[PDB]
Amino acid sequence: NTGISNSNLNKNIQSRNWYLSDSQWAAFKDDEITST
């Protein structure tokens, strides 16, 4: 376990998002991204 450093791995930090559920994804509009 103690092999390397926990927790945030590598100023302005950013991470990958979790995916949306079936309902949320169906109801999603890519214009939410598109602007901007």
């Binding site: 990958r16 949306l20 169906a26 991204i33």
Partner: protein
């Protein structure tokens, strides 16, 4: 004569490809001075520096182009520039697909069928790039080849609206949403986890994934006028991987409501008459199109396939060179995990729509990619099989003595208290 760390001029005549095979571990930086060049339909902006690593691809000259390139693993007299005579087929397909988007009630729902390295994924990428290019359509790109990582990791089949330009630098086309500011607008995909290395390992599971993707795809199209008006572009696994009778193609056509078929084969290839005889009564022969061998499409070995699978796993947690992400490492107890494993021909003989429990051991889980469902730890297998995917995690270390695991998450925070699925995919050194 010998690799340099300086810039070199390159004039690509109109209608020619600069064929690149980045065999070595070094980077290639490209800066366009004048003209129009494209990586599978995506135009490279003039004066902007583009960086490429460990992938095979063409830089096509729409117009005579002058560019500068910097790469120490190539010399001026080792460059491969060849004229392309096949783009006409791609444009002609695009403008006919486009005529359907403007005139018909809904956009075309197209399948691309063909053999190993016929140019299926190259055609799909270019059609998506072009769909967006002229009259701004948002087609749904559907990947049904789990070995091919596009917008996600390798265990998946996916549906992704091509809402803005692809990343010309990436073999994965681009990436999913992030928590902050990016140069490009990223994608919002629907991912279904197959998790096994090859389609033949299950099939019933592969077909359930298609059934599940088909359902949500219909729900999105019902609610999204722009995606409904644009169509679908469905990329399938290499034809050899599917049964003789092509029963799996009937399932795909039915589940994804396919109305157009594009066949990538030879003029004397028996595939043409085979497809015409089976899908012609269902789609109508006018709706089945033959695309000859595409120029430049090169063969791909399993070593390059594995190289891409590795790149896409790092890209999931850490991002790309131009977009660095911060994944989160947590220490977890053996007791804090509910992991299931899919049925497969190797372990179970048969390969049924079923999940089996996984016992927490370093032999079972070390360096494994794990799918996180939306289902609660306590949920039964029937609920888990049908549950959507939240994301993926990597199990870096498994300590027997202390009864702990080190898990890498894409999202900083707690370990989601959800049911999980073990994939056949492995990645060493987080």
């Amino acid at each position: 004569i010998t690799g340099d760390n300086e810039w070199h001029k390159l004039v690509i005549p109109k209608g020619s490809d600069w064929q690149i095979d980045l065999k070595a571990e070094g980077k290639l930086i490209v800066k366009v001075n004048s003209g129009i060049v494209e990586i599978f339909g995506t135009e490279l902006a003039v004066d902007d520096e583009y960086t490429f690593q460990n992938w095979k691809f063409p830089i096509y000259a729409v117009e005579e182009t002058e560019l500068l390139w910097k790469c120490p693993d190539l010399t001026t007299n080792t460059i491969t520039v060849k004229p392309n005579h096949t783009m006409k087929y791609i444009y002609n397909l695009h403008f006919m697909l486009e005529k359907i988007r403007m005139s018909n009630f809904e956009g075309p729902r197209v399948v691309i069928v063909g053999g190993s390295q016929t140019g299926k994924t190259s055609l799909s990428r270019t059609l998506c790039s072009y769909a967006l290019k002229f009259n701004a359509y948002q087609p749904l790109y559907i990947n049904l080849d789990p070995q091919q990582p596009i917008f996600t990791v390798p265990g998946c089949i996916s549906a992704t609206p091509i809402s803005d330009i692809l990343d010309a630098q990436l073999p994965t086309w681009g990436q999913s949403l992030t928590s902050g500011a990016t140069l490009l607008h990223n994608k919002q995909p629907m991912v279904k986890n197959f998790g096994l290395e090859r389609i033949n390992e299950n099939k019933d599971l592969y077909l359930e994934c298609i059934s599940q993707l088909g359902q949500v795809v219909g729900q999105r199209l019902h609610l999204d006028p722009q995606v409904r008006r644009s169509g679908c572009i469905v990329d399938t696994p290499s034809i050899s991987q599917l049964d003789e009778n092509l029963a799996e193609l009937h399932h795909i056509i039915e589940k994804l409501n396919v109305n157009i078929m594009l066949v990538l084969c030879s003029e004397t290839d028996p595939l043409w008459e085979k497809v015409k005889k089976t899908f012609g009564p269902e789609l109508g022969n006018n709706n089945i199109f033959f695309i000859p061998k595409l120029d430049g499409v090169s063969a791909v070995d399993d070593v390059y396939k594995r190289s891409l699978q590795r790149t896409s796993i790092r890209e999931y947690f850490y991002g790309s060179l131009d977009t660095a992400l911060s994944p989160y490492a947590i220490g977890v107890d053996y007791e804090d995990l509910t992991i299931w494993k899919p049925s497969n021909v190797f372990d179970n003989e048969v390969g049924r729509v079923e999940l089996f429990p996984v016992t927490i051991t370093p032999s079972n889980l070390q360096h494994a990619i794990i799918a996180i469902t939306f289902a609660e730890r306590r949920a039964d297998q029937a609920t888990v099989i049908k549950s959507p995917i939240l994301g993926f995690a990597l199990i870096t270390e498994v300590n027997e003595k202390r009864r702990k695991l080190r898990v890498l998450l894409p999202v900083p925070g707690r370990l989601p208290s959800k049911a999980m699925i073990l994939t056949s995919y492995r990645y060493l050194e987080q």
